[PDB]
Amino acid sequence: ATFEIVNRCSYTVWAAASKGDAALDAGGRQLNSGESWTINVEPGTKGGKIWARTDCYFDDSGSGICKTGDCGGLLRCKRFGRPPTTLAEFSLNQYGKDYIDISNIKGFNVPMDFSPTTRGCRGVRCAADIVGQCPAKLKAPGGGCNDACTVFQTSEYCCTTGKCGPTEYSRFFKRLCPDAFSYVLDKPTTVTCPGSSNYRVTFCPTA
Numbered sequence: 514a515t516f517e518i519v520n521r522c523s524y525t526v527w528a529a530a531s532k533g534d535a536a537l538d539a540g541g542r543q544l545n546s547g548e549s550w551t552i553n554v555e556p557g558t559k560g561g562k563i564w565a566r567t568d569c570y571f572d573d574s575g576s577g578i579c580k581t582g583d584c585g586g587l588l589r590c591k592r593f594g595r596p597p598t599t600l601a602e603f604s605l606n607q608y609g610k611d612y613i614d615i616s617n618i619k620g621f622n623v624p625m626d627f628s629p630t631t632r633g634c635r636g637v638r639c640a641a642d643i644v645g646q647c648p649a650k651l652k653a654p655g656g657g658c659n660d661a662c663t664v665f666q667t668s669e670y671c672c673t674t675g676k677c678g679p680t681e682y683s684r685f686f687k688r689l690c691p692d693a694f695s696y697v698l699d700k701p702t703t704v705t706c707p708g709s710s711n712y713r714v715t716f717c718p719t720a
């Protein structure tokens with residue numbers, strides 16, 4: 514699949530793309546306002562994610578730190594990022610179908626649109642001012658709005674036993690972004706696309 518990743522924000526972001534145990538494509542890149550990055554993701558990739566990182570510093574060797582979404586201090590991410598991170602998630606070519614979603618299960622940092630660029634399915638968006646409205650206990654000083662699992666580490670928020678319900682904190686995310694996952698057992702907002710679709714991920718889509 515081809516993914517075009519576009520930064521429509523007025524600020525720089527450092528995009529990242531990983532399947533947890535490996536980079537997708539180059540794994541990460543700086544995107545100034547308006548810049549686009551096109552990556553190729555191998556057919557059959559299960560459990561890929563794309564996210565933005567904010568307020569990064571990197572040296573000549575691609576080592577450093579970001580205030581949101583840091584993936585072990587690397588520019589080119591091999592691993593997933595530290596919350597809070599709005600996530601574009603996908604599994605490709607699974608018995609003829611692609612599956613996509615946006616998730617707030619690991620919090621929110623940057624607004625995002627995740628849309629197919631080929632025919633046969635709809636896109637999803639979370640573009641509300643979650644950071645501005647974020648409950649005080651969930652606000653991350655570095656920027657962003659953490660999920661309640663990250664902050665409180667309870668079985669109910671983390672859904673440790675595979676049984677959990679919605680919470681005051683999950684409902685906060687869901688009221689602002691109904692088309693994104695708000696907790697582990699949310700009613701799926703997964704979109705099914707034809708296998709081998711292509712996609713666009715746009716940061717700050719209403720910017």
Ligand SMILES: [K+]
Nearest residue numbers: 624717718719
């Ligand atoms: K936006």
